[PDB]
Amino acid sequence: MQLLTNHLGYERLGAKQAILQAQHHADIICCQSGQSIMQLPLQACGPVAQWHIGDTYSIDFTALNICGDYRIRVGDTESASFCVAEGLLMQNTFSDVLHYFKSQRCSGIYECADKKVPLFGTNETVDVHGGWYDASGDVSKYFSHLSYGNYLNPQQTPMVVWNMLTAYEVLEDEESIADFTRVRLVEEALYGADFLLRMQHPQGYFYMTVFDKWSKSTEQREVCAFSTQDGHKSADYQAGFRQGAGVAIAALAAASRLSNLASTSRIPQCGDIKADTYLEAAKKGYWHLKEMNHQYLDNGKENIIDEYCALLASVELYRSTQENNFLAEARMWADKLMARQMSDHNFAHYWAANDDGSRPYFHAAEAGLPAIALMQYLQIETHAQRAEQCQSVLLNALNFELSITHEVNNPFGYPRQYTKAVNGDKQSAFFMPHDNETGYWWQGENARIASLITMAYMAQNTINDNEIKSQLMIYAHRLTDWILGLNPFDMCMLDGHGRNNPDYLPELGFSNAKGGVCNGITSGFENEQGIAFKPEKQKDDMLQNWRWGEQWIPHGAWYLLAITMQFKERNHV
Amino acid sequence: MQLLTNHLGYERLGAKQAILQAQPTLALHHADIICCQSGQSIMQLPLQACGPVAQWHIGDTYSIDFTALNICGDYRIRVGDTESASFCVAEGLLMQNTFSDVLHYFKSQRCSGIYECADKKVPLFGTNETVDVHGGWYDASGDVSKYFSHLSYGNYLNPQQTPMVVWNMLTAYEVLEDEESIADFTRVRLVEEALYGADFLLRMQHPQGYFYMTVFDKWSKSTEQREVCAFSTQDGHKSADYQAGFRQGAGVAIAALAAASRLSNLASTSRIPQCGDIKADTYLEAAKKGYWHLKEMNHQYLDNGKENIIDEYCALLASVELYRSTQENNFLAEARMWADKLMARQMSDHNFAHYWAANDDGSRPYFHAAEAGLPAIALMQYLQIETHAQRAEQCQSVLLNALNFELSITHEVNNPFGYPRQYTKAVNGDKQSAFFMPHDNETGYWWQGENARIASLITMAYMAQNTINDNEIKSQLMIYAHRLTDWILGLNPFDMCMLDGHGRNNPDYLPELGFSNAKGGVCNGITSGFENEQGIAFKPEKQKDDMLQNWRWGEQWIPHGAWYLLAITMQFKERNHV
Ligand code: NA
Ligand code: NA
């Protein structure tokens, strides 16, 4: 018998569960007392897919709202201690995540190299210094990659910037947040913004990547795109809306607006914030891609990823300029994005990746973004009928997430998805399919998980359905639990907190950093109905083991925004 | 009862203990060491009573010596029905588990953003000139000011700050050079951090040759208030005495710049990825210029105009490194002059033979909350260059006497935790031995936990392994170094690991004000009682919420991490020492 909990703890007013894996009822013990304060029943749950973890029971101790330290006991099996606190993850983890970013800033010989990096295929060198190393084992810097697969592009460095700026605005009205924390957060954000400036060519487009073929050599760093697990470079480095650039424009436009917030006047300053420079870059990049986008896409065709990224761009540009043309632009993108919601024989209201819905949208970094982008758009849409129609597509999208998550036995509340392999049919699953358009790529989904936590909390201020809001709060707390150690490996994936933190290749000097988040758990390597983390047969194989333990900056950025949204909503019952 | 252990664990070879806190009245007489994986006891051990400690009032304690355990794995201690937490026995343990995190800690504390923007044009106190002193690291988890040193008005308390970080990193980089199991990417990270620091040292040098003592904001976190200055007292009154004498960081800064200039001698330097060349000549010329300028001016920069032990250990480092980097006889003559001065600081009185004196007649003993291992470490550096047989033997006699003194004073009284003791004197008190520095001292306010001091004495105990010729002393120094290491990592009466991110009960500083401790960093730590100097305290109830006092315990400060990083690197070098 093992009692699994969130290794850190539970938000004071959140949904609260533990999972017993055993082949009784449960006590909740006050640590300070040593004595039982609740006695609760075990709800039986079936076996999960082919995870082969035995039967499980959940214990629901949501009603506990007393701040303290507690333990769960069943029989003579005790969980580890965990904490219940208001603002628990804000209080215990938010600072560490900023230090993680500052520790990952491109610096020393790499920063020196990146002042004079060549454009692939040419001898022209450009100054693209700044930003962050992408991963605990990769000093390359990315807008996105996997572009040659079309449907898999993750938003990388730009997403970190937009997430931090958006977190900063959310915290603006929080009295218990200190101005020094604002100084640190906006610094990391504008540091990122400054790199997004340097990644823009005079023509207006942004570079996709500064890539060294994973060599760690300064001489191999080049502005390029790249494809396959062999990292073959190409000259197709102009970033289309889905290849990072839409989110970069969105982040730049948000950055230009900081002087709208009272804290920006109050905190210490030096120089002035280059506000107009950010805004002009965002506008220029935007009108450039409305001219050039399709020519930058590998298959020449826009898909749901373009549409949510361009929606964020045009929305932020509208908030930052109040120019009617950007509201028209946002309406245009929102209409397209809403039309990706489609129904078939398996699901009502799933998200389509392509035009006919034959390829469902699923995304290991950012599955919450279609709904997130719609919520952002809802903050600006004053047309009552457009707002109403959008609310309903947004409600169906939230319902679809809950519904597919609950379709099958799922004691952990792992957010399920609708996927398709290249030689396979559409099907619901826990984890992304391994046979996809990249021909190799799949890994833990912590960023995707945190993007869905972010969507669930954002919905609290957006929708009207109190029942759905309720189920979202619960969904959000269990996805949070998974990342923080309530999973079958009893493993906290936020480094420096909880137990069993995994490492990457510290024997080779590629160690995971405190405050960072790793890729995480996948299906099995041979059995895609299985579950795995550093499975025995691949654990020592360097061509494969990065799928599990390596850290990657989008995980940390989406976790940062997730916990900031949790903090906003921490008292909404 | 409670079983206290190193929260992380024990280096595979050498001294290992746990401490039991239990009633005087304990019927039990043995401990078992349990293998976590199987639950089998693999060793059974006697309990040795240690007796009460000073006026700590922690009750009775017993030590459990499981040094004989060499077998890698996870274990716990059991006494009766009481068990300790689990811990690891591993070769290279702290290197494997903490080194990378301490480097990420430094990179996380680099001066950046608006503070970097301010420091490119910071005013010099009392003038209308401004200077570009950007770079380096924030001094503390609650202080974005940057320091060579401070407490200069107290004369005997100056701690080596930013410069010590750079010398410690460079010294660690060199020790690691012939370690096959350290990866080159680690070397890239460590030399980056060290040269980042050395670059800041260069910007801190005035064209005349002296270094600025401090870039200080009166603790305000205001960009405009930053200013090159000295300051004094707890109110931070600024002044124009910002020329750093040898003891005010400048001697260690010269040592660091001279060590930096030599990195091209190391095979790794050519091997790792390049982006142009390290500024070797620039560092060496600055070190020489700074050195000769203080040979002329030092006395004028000192608050009482008189050098003391701290000038002599810092200037011994400076001259030893300049000799190493130049091979010029000139610098070996300097180093010999400084060593002769430092050795003459060892004195005896009715309490202690061969204590260290801070002033000329030994009426004020040397004690130092950041760096008490430095007199012996400087002498060890010098022994590395001294070719003359009689000079070496005489210096070895003084060193062995100093190592014996630290072991004697630590073992003078009941001391289950092996806390390194020291010989102190309050401004209106007599010389006496103690655990913790005296609260009534020349500063009129300053005292705090001693982690950097603890790690400098760990560093001294491991450097001795390669320097001295006495096996029995080398052996008691290994034991001492291990217990010092335990204290920092949670084998203490607070059951508190003070390396943030590792172990349990990590303390914070003022996170509700946005001043959060950083993972990989080390806090000040434990002190005597606030009212009772014979007691022990860490965030005591009466002062825990008082901001004029609570910085003494939980705040992080960069000397602690930097001395911790060197201490574990010297342990790693000596890990196979049979
Ligand atoms: Na492209
Ligand atoms: Na001075």
Backbone discontinuities in chain A, residue before each (C to N > 2.5 A): 23
Residue B183, judged by CB atoms within 10 A of its CB (0-12, 13-18, 19+), counts as: middle
Compute CA distances B347 → A379, B350, B461, whole Å: 76, 11, 21
Contact of B441 with B426, CB cutoff 8 Å: yes
Residues around ligand 1, an ion, CB closer than 5 A:
A 236, 238, 296
CA of A422 to the centre of ligand 1 (A): 22
Tell me which DSSP letter residue B24 carries: T
The residues with which A58 forms a beta bridge, in sequence order, are: A19, A43
Are A178 and B110 a contacting pair at CB < 8 A?
no
Which residue type, as a one-letter code, is found at position B216?
A: F
Give the strand pairing for A9-11 and A17-21: unpaired
Which residues, at least 6 apart from B13, have a Cβ–Cβ distance to it below 8 Å? B70, B91, B575, B576, B577, B578
Helix (H, G, I), strand (E, B) or coil at B505: coil
Nearest-by-Cβ selection for B275 from A112, A270, A508: A112
Backbone angles phi, psi at A228, to 5 degrees: 70, 165
Half-sphere exposure of A404 (CA within 13 A, CB side): 22
Which secondary-structure segment (H or E) carries A520? none
Q: How far apart are CA A190 and CA A207, in angstroms?
A: 19
Are B112 and A179 a contacting pair at CB < 8 A?
no
Nearest CA in chain B to A192: B113
DSSP A261-308: SHHHHHS--SS---HHHHHHHHHHHHHHHHHHHHHHSTTS---HHHHH
Angle at A414 between CA A412 and CA A419, to 5 degrees: 150
Angle between helix axes A88-103 and A553-568 (nearest 10 degrees) is 150
Judged by its nearest atom, the ligand closest to the C-alpha of residue A224 is 1
- For residue B382, the distance in angstroms to the closest alpha carbon of chain A comes to 32
How many other C-beta atoms lie within 10 A of the C-beta of residue A86? 15
Sign, Cα dihedral of B61, B67, B69, B74: positive
Q: For A354-385, give the secondary structure using H, E and C.
A: CCCCCCECCCCCCCCHHHHHHHHHHCCCCCHH
DSSP B106-170: HHHTB--HHHHHHHTTEEBTTSS-EE----SB-SBTTB--EES---GGGSS-----HHHHHHHHH
Nearest CA in chain B to A494: B501
Nearest residue to B374 (alpha-carbon basis) of B202, B566, B213, B195? B566
Tell me which DSSP letter residue A42 carries: P
Which residues, at least 6 apart from B220, have a Cβ–Cβ distance to it below 8 Å? none
Helix (H, G, I), strand (E, B) or coil at A161: helix
Helix (H, G, I), strand (E, B) or coil at B100: helix
End-to-end Cα distance, chain A: 33
State whether residue A63 sits within 8 Å of chain B by CB: no
Nearest residue to A430 (alpha-carbon basis) of A447, A406, A400, A450? A406
Instruction: Supply B418's token pair.
Output: 């092996």
Which residues, at least 6 apart from A193, have a Cβ–Cβ distance to it below 8 Å? A161, A165, A251, A252, A255, A278
Are A178 and B512 a contacting pair at CB < 8 A?
yes
- For residue B496, the distance in angstroms to the closest alpha carbon of chain A comes to 16
Radius of gyration of chain B (CA): 23
How many residue pairs from chains A and B have C-beta atoms closer than 8 A? 112
Q: How far apart are CA B160 and CA B144, in angstroms?
A: 17
Backbone angles phi, psi at A2, to 5 degrees: -135, 135
Nearest-by-Cβ selection for A509 from B112, B184, B196: B184
Nearest residue to A340 (alpha-carbon basis) of A304, A391, A291? A304
Q: How far apart are CA A499 and CA A480, in angstroms?
A: 15
Which residue type, as a one-letter code, is found at position B323?
A: Y
Give the strand pairing for B214-216 and A77-78: unpaired
Judged by its nearest atom, the ligand closest to the C-alpha of residue A120 is 1
Compute CA distances A38 → A1, A83, B344, whole Å: 20, 16, 70
Give the strand pairing for A77-78 and A68-74: antiparallel
Q: How far apart are CA A278 and CA B203, in angstroms?
A: 31
Q: How far apart are CA A142 and CA A121, in angstroms?
A: 18
Top residue of B86, B103, B108, B179 to mutate, by most chain A CBs within 10 Å, is B108
Compute CA distances A99 → A191, A496, A560, whole Å: 14, 12, 12
Contact of B481 with B17, CB cutoff 8 Å: no
Name chain A contacts of B118, Cβ cutoff 8 Å.
270
Residue A285, judged by CB atoms within 10 A of its CB (0-12, 13-18, 19+), counts as: buried
Contact of B553 with B560, CB cutoff 8 Å: no
Which residues, at least 6 apart from B569, have a Cβ–Cβ distance to it below 8 Å? B95, B99, B171, B172, B175, B176
Nearest residue to B247 (alpha-carbon basis) of B335, B295, B309, B304? B309
Sign, Cα dihedral of A70, A71, A73, A76: negative
Tabulate helix, strand, coil % of chain A (nearest 5). Answer: 40, 15, 45
The residues with which A517 forms a beta bridge, in sequence order, are: A494
**Which residues 213-232 of B have a C-beta within 8 angstroms of A?**
221-223
Contact of A65 with A50, CB cutoff 8 Å: no
| Region of residue B541 (phi > 0: left; psi between -120 and 50: alpha; otherwise: beta) | alpha
Instruction: Supply A32's token pair.
Output: 């300070």
Over the range B319-339, which residues count as b (16 or more CB within 10 Å of their CB) and which as e?
Answer: bbbbbbbbeeeebbebbbebb
Helix (H, G, I), strand (E, B) or coil at A62: coil
Sign, Cα dihedral of A319, A205, A116, A138: positive
- For residue B503, the distance in angstroms to the closest alpha carbon of chain A comes to 10
Are B113 and A509 a contacting pair at CB < 8 A?
no
Contact of A473 with A13, CB cutoff 8 Å: no
Helix and strand element counts for chain A (H, E)? 15, 20
State whether residue B114 sits within 8 Å of chain A by CB: yes
Contact of B200 with B272, CB cutoff 8 Å: no
Which residues, at least 6 apart from B156, have a Cβ–Cβ distance to it below 8 Å? B308, B310, B358, B359, B364, B366, B442
Residue A365, judged by CB atoms within 10 A of its CB (0-12, 13-18, 19+), counts as: buried
Which residues, at least 6 apart from B573, have a Cβ–Cβ distance to it below 8 Å? B175, B176, B179, B462, B466
Which residue type, as a one-letter code, is found at position B276?
A: G
Q: How far apart are CA B413 and CA B55, in angstroms?
A: 12
Are A180 and B513 a contacting pair at CB < 8 A?
yes
Q: How far apart are CA B103 and CA A513, in angstroms?
A: 10
Which secondary-structure segment (H or E) carries B352? none
Name chain A contacts of B107, Cβ cutoff 8 Å.
102-103, 105, 107
Using the structure block, give the residue that is written with the tokens 């990866």. B183
Q: How far apart are CA B446 and CA B154, in angstroms?
A: 10
Name the experiment that determined this structure: X-ray
State whether residue A294 sits within 8 Å of chain B by CB: no
Q: How far apart are CA B155 and CA B358, in angstroms?
A: 10
Which residues, at least 6 apart from B112, have a Cβ–Cβ distance to it below 8 Å? A102, A187, A191
Tabulate helix, strand, coil % of chain B (nearest 5). Answer: 40, 15, 45
Nearest CA in chain A to B500: A496
Nearest-by-Cβ selection for A506 from B100, B118, B515: B100
Nearest residue to B571 (alpha-carbon basis) of B451, B478, B497? B478
Instruction: Supply B440's token pair.
Output: 């009534």
How many other C-beta atoms lie within 10 A of the C-beta of residue B466? 15
Helix (H, G, I), strand (E, B) or coil at B62: strand
Are A108 and B188 a contacting pair at CB < 8 A?
yes
Helix (H, G, I), strand (E, B) or coil at A176: coil
Give the strand pairing for B73-79 and B87-90: antiparallel
Nominal resolution (angstroms): 1.9
Compute CA distances A293 → A136, A307, A436, whole Å: 32, 12, 24
Instruction: Supply B242's token pair.
Output: 């910002």
Backbone angles phi, psi at A299, to 5 degrees: -110, 10
Domains of chain B, earliest start first: 1-92 (2.60.40.10), 93-578 (1.50.10.10)
Backbone angles phi, psi at B573, to 5 degrees: -55, -40
Using the structure block, give the residue that is written with the tokens 């809001």. A469
Name chain B contacts of A179, Cβ cutoff 8 Å.
514
End-to-end Cα distance, chain B: 35
Which residue type, as a one-letter code, is found at position A429?
A: A
Half-sphere exposure of B305 (CA within 13 A, CB side): 1
Q: How far apart are CA A97 and CA B104, in angstroms?
A: 12
Angle between helix axes B389-411 and B471-488 (nearest 10 degrees) is 50
Which residue type, as a one-letter code, is found at position A460?
A: Q
Helical H runs in B346-388? 374-383
CA of B223 to the centre of ligand 2 (A): 24
Q: For A381-416, give the secondary structure using H, E and C.
A: CCCHHHHHHHHHHHHHHHHHHHHHHCCCCCCCCCCC
Contact of A259 with A265, CB cutoff 8 Å: yes
